[PDB]
Amino acid sequence: CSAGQISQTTTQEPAVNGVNAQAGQVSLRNVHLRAPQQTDYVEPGTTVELLFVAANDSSNKLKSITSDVGEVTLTGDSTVPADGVLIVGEPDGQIQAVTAEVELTKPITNGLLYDFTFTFEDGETTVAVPISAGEQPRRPVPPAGPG
């Protein structure tokens, strides 16, 4: 009975940090926020970078503003997807051109979900983007004195 119809394999998510978004005719996969998280929250004014791909299911290429909170800037090399990808920047170890990044003006921490609204030529989607890092291992905790 486990064979086909509601399968435990094709009804799955990839083991990766950022969310997906099938809606709005732009295939929007692995959107996350690369944010080196120094304290409780990352303080306002810190520039932290938003990452995704924007695959096309055909051409939707516009990337109007895509801003909910944090003053999202973009790059003019944005009219890429004609049944193709839009790789934003290097997420994590992508060694090989759109520096999408936010100037927070709100304290954000890792482990939360933050509603970003990606608007396109076809529509907009709220994604509840996470904070991610494929960073180096954890910064060294101070070893506690016994007692």
């Binding site: 399968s7 094709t10 083991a15 940090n17 994590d92 992508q94 494929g134 291992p137 954890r138």
Partner: protein, 223 residues
Amino acid sequence: QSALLRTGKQLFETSCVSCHGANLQGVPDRGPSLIGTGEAAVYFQVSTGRMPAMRGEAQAPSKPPHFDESQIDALGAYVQANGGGPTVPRDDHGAVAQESLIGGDVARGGDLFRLNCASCHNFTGKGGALSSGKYAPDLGDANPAQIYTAMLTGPQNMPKFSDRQLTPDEKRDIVAYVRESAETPSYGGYGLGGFGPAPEGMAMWIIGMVAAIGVAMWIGSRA
């Protein structure tokens, strides 16, 4: 090398884009997304053989590998260039490091394998059952780089024990344990599996107790 990325693309187009959409996306309810999983994920999922698969079932099982090491680097670097995430650890030759991964400790690896995951598999790394048809596999036929990239990017139903959840010292330490727990012989007899009492029962009955009743019917008569 860009020709290596092109080789990864040539193998990508003619094996999977029925279930990954050829923009490294996810074909909905037929195959999930693939960016961000990375070269480590593709090394474990094709070097074991699993993901060039043939049905979406309870879980996609192990199988012979569909590509070789001269092409896994191409396919994993292609998925890391399209996406980007964990990478497979490599030695001073540029090839995939498989022997430099066994850590210098085993007992820490024993306790850490035992705490963090041996709930699912077994003590020595034999398989274990899972919820609805899915199952943990045996760790005996497991390349150490596949073990590191198995815990590094968790394929199916296993948690991805990340670079920050378990440190690479700890992950080298776990693959030091499992390559000397599924490799060391069973001290003191045949190893009736790795999990104890049910094979020991079934080998009590048909090996020991059937021989006992056979001796008892050779000695006593019947009337």
